[model samples]
Target: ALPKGKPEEGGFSAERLKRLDDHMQTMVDRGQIAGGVTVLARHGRVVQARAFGRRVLGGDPMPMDAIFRIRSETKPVTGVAMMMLYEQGLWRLDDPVSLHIPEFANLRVAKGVDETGQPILTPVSRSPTMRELMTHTAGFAYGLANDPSSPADQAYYRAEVLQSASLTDLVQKVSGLPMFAEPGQLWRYSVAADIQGYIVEKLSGQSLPVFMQERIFTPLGMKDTAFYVPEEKQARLAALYDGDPATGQLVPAVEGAWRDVSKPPAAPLGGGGLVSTAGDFARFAQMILNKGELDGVRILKPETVALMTQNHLPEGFVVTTNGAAGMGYGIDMAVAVDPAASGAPVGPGTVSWGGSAGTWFWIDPANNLFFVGMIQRLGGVGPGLDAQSRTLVYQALERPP
Candidate 1:
């Protein structure tokens, strides 16, 4: 467990921090969420580590170390892995993705339909670059094709691009599908990170699990973080839940063992595959806040960390997923490029992302702090609980030492 200290040591008002706990408790009391765990740290000292409610409705109390499926939160981890590979000079930002994955060379864009109602496909002038892939402008469809009428998106589902038998299989399916648009034309939440997983396997000559374990998890002492939970650790896995649309009450969504289990999953997703605990993720976030080093282990150069968090979005480009005031895409996470314009409560350069199952976290360089919250409600608690937690955290935080 991370050592705990008085909030004052971290420059946070201890009294004010209680407000966060109270608000979360209220949500649990109102049945908005089954339970949750939160960890808040600054200057290498943990100011708060708390759990609320039960692991399941009318079940055991939520444990601080309970593992939850982190879903899309896995994207940032994949991004960091890609950056480490970048340090090896294996790939460059603007190089066409086709250079690394030859199958992308013949990619096509889905335009519309012909008068006969046949599908119309247009050849892309240029393939998406590695940078565009990292920034999610590579034109791949997220299984979550939000637009019902998107022809490319429908083709993505028809091809089963996301659920392929393996990463290589995933790549083959995606490369053959029509792109949602020309690369660099839009920021559509996509399988770019999963595609990176395939690239990681190709470049490192190792499975994604082995590479991440050896290069990241082991060195960072993230014992509870992995592609799946083993038989021995199954008891600590949190049960999954989703709200009843009509009643706004929690309902059991799935079994606790979930996807990854004793054996590694064949198609390890780079975008939404791993299960992790709040304590484990705190170390990951703190490493970012410390500019790629934690407990004397350096995973990446400071400049590389800066670049990963830096906004790589095309000028004035709008990210379809979020409408934050001055928000922009950075690697696989959201960056508050213009804090004031974006109406963000934290300092500039804070990078954050959440999972579909309600986990959220942020690393604030300006404040020298990071926070992690874990829950297992699928479809998320919407933006209500998420925004409330952020709004409360910054209230007690101090800007500088």
Candidate 2:
């Protein structure tokens, strides 16, 4: 955990920080969410870390250390892992992914469908680069299409990329499928992080779990971040929730397609398969804010981190995803290029990402600040927490550090 200090020590108004707590309480009272934990830190000091609401409705009060599924937030961490290997000169960012995973060498692009409902594919002009994979320009899809009625989307669903038993199996399945866009031609959110995880495994000769623990979690003292929660720690797992479409009230989130958190999967996903506590994740975030070193432990060089966080998308490319508007793709997170266009209380050069289950986090290099909010809900609820928290945190800052 970051060293604790009064809010004033971090240049924040204590009374305004209290307003953040009150706002969160109001969120809980209104049935907008089950419960959550929010932690903010600045200048290397923890200013606020608190929990509100219940673990489950009518259950125990939420604990500050409660574990929550961090989902896509794992992407940034996976990107870091890949860059660590890059720092060692093992591979270059522009290296073709086919160089490591040869099955991808003959990939094709989806042009359209034939009268017989078969996808008409054309050969890609060139194989995608590792940088393209990191930036979501590799043309891969999540396989869970947004438009269920589209024939092309239906084909993606039938691919069943999630059911692959291993990373090699995942690559084989993905290689056989058609790319939605040619490499570097367009931006799309994808399973690129999972593919990066496999790359980490191949290069490091260590499983993602072992590699992360030794290189990141252990050195940074993030004790509770992992692919699975042990049976002994199950009680600390916050109950997942989702909005009731009819009433907009909190409802127990169903296990729709997520892997069992109690048992490790054959292919541990680097994309969206990790659980972490507020303190644990905050430590990880702080390391990034500190330019890859925290408490004398350096996970990455300052130059390497600077390169990873900067916008890397090809010129003229734009991302249309929420929170991604007015931003450019980085290694695995969004880099705020025009804060005014971001539609939030963020500043330029801010690096951020969130998970599917409503977990969110950010690192503001311009402000020497970072925050982590833990919740287990899906859909649009997560962004509300992010915007609210960002507003409150900046509001409380009396002056820049």
How do the residues 1-401 of candidate 1 rate in per-residue lDDT, one tens digit apiece?
56688999998888899999999899898988889999999888899999999987888899998988888899999999999999999999978999999998878887887787545888787989999999998887766553547777777776767667899999988878888888888887888998999999999999999999999899988998888889898888888888788997889875344254556888888888888899889999988988899888999999999999999997877755531568888998988888788567877888988887788888889888888888888764735666787888888886554
Worst 10 residues of 2 by lDDT: 146-155
What is the Cα root-mean-square deviation between model 2 and the actual structure?
1.7
Compose the digit string of candidate 2's lDDT tens values, residues 28-52: 9998888999988988999999999
All candidates' TM-scores? 0.95, 0.96
Angstrom error of the Cα, residue 62, model 2: value is: 0.7
Query: What overall lDDT, based on C-alpha atoms, would model 1 receive against the true structure?
Result: 0.85
lDDT of each: 0.85, 0.86
| Steric clashes per prediction | 2, 0
Error of 1 at 66 (Å): 0.5
RMSD of 1: 2.1
Native-to-model Cα distance after best TM-score fit, residue 121 in candidate 1, in Å: 0.8
